[PDB]
Coordinates of C-alpha atoms and ligand atoms in Angstrom, one line a residue:
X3 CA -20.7 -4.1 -14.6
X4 CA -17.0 -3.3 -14.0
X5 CA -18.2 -1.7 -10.8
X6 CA -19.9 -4.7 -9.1
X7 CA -16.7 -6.7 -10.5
X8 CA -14.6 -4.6 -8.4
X9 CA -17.5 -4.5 -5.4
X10 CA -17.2 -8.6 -5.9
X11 CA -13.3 -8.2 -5.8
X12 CA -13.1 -6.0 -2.3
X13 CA -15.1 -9.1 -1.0
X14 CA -13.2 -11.5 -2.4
X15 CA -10.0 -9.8 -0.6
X16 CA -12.0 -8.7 2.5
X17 CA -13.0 -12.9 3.2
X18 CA -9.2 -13.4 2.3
X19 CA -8.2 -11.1 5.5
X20 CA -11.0 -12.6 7.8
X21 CA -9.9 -14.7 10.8
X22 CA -11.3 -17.9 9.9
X23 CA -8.6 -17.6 6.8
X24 CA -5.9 -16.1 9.4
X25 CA -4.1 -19.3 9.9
X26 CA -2.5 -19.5 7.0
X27 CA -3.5 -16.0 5.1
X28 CA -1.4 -14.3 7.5
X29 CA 2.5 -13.7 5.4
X30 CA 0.5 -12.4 2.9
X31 CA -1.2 -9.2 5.1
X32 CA 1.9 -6.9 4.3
X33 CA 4.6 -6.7 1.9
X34 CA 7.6 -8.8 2.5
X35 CA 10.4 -7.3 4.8
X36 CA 12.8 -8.1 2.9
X37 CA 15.3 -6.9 5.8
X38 CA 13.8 -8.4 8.4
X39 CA 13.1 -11.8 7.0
X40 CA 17.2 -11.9 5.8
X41 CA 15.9 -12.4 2.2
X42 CA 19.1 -10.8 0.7
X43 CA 18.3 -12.0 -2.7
X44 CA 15.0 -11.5 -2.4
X45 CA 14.5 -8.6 -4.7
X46 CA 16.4 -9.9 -7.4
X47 CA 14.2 -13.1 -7.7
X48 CA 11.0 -11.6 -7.2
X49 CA 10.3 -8.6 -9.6
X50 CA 6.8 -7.8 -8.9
X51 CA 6.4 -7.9 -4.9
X52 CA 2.8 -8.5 -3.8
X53 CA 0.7 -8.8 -0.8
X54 CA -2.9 -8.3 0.2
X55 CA -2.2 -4.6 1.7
X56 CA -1.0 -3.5 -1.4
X57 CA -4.0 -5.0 -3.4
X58 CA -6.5 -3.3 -1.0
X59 CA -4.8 0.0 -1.8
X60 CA -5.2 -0.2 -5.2
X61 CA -8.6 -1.5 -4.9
X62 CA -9.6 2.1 -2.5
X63 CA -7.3 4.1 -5.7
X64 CA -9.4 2.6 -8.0
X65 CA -6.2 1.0 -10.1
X66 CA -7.9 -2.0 -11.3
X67 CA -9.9 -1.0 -14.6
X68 CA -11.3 -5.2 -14.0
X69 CA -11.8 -7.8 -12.1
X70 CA -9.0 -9.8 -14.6
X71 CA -6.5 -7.3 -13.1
X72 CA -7.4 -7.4 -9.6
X73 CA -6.7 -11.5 -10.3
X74 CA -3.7 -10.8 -12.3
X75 CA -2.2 -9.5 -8.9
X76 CA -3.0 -11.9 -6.4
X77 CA -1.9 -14.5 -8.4
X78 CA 1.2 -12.8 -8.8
X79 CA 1.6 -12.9 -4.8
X80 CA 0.7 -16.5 -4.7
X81 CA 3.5 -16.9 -7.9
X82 CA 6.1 -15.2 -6.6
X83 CA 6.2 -17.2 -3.3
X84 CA 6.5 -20.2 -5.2
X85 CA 9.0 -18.5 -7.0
X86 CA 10.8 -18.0 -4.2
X87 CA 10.4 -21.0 -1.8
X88 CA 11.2 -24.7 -2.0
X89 CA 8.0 -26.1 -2.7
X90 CA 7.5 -28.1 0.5
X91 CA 8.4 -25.0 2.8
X92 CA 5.5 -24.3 5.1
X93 CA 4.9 -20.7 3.4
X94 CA 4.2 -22.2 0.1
X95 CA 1.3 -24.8 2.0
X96 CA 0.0 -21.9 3.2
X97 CA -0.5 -19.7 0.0
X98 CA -1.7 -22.8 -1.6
X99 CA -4.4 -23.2 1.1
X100 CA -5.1 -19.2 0.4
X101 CA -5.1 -19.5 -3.5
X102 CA -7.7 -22.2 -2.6
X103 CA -10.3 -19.7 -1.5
X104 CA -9.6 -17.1 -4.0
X105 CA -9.6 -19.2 -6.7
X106 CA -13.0 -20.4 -5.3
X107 CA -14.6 -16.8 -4.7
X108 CA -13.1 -15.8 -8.3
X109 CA -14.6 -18.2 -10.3
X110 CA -18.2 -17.7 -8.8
X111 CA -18.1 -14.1 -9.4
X112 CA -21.0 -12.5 -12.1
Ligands
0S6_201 C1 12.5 -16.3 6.2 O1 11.5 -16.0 5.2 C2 11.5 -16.9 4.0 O2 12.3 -17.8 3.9 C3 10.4 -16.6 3.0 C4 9.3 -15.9 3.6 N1 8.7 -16.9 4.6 C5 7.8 -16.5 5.3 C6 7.2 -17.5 6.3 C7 5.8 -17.5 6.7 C8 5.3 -18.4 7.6 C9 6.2 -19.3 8.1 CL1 5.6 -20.5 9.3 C10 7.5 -19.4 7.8 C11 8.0 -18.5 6.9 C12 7.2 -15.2 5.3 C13 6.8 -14.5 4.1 S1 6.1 -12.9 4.5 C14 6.2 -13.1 6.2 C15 5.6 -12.0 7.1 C16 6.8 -14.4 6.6 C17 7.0 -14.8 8.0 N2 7.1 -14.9 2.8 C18 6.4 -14.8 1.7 C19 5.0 -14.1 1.5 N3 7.1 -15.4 0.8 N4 8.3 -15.9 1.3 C20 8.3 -15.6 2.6
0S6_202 C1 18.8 -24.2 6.3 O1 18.0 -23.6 5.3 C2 17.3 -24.4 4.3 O2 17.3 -25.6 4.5 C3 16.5 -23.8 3.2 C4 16.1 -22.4 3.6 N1 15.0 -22.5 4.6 C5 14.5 -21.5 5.1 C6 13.4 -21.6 6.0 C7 12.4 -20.6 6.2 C8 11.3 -20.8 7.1 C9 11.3 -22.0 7.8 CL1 9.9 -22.2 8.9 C10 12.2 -23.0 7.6 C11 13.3 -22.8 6.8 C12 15.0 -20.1 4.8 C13 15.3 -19.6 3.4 S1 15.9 -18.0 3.5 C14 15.8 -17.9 5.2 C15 16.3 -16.5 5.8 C16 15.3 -19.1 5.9 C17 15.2 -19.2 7.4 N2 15.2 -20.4 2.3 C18 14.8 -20.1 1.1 C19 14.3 -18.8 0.6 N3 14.9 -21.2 0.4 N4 15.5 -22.2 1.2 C20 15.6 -21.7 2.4

């Protein structure tokens, strides 16, 4: 049960790094370089960094006990770019268009 969950979840995040999502999926492949993006403040906003890399590591270490946790962290890389951005920057139209097909593939899961 939790096991197919988590099978459902590495699909979920494996469609999320496939090229036909790679237009505007791509910021989110790695964590944010804090140094070479300038973001000076960056850490102090954003608590909790997140990106997909990360998630996929956890997913191989077996860290999420659910599929409610594996959720709880990408919307926490969606929510801490809008944290971080004006909301009309072109970063934040492209996690939207991202959360779009996660939210999809996560509410059709078993
Ligand atoms: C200069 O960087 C910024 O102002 C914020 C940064 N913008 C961007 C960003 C992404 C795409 C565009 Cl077109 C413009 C800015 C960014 C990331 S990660 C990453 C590799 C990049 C290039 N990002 C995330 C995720 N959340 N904020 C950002
Ligand atoms: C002149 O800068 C602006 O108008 C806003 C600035 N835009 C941007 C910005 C980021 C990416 C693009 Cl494509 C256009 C503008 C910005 C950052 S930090 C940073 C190193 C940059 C280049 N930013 C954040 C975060 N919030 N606002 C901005």
């Amino acid at each position: 049960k939790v096991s197919e969950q988590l099978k459902c979840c590495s699909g979920i995040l494996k469609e999320m790094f496939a090229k036909k999502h790679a237009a505007y999926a791509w910021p989110f492949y790695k964590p944010v370089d804090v140094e070479a993006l300038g973001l000076h403040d960056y850490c102090d906003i954003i608590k909790h960094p997140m990106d997909m890399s990360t998630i996929k590591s956890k997913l191989e270490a077996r860290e999420y006990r659910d599929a409610q946790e594996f959720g709880a962290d990408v919307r926490l890389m969606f929510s801490n770019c809008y944290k971080y951005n004006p909301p009309d920057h072109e970063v934040v139209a492209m996690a939207r268009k991202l959360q779009d097909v996660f939210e999809m593939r996560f509410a059709k899961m078993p």
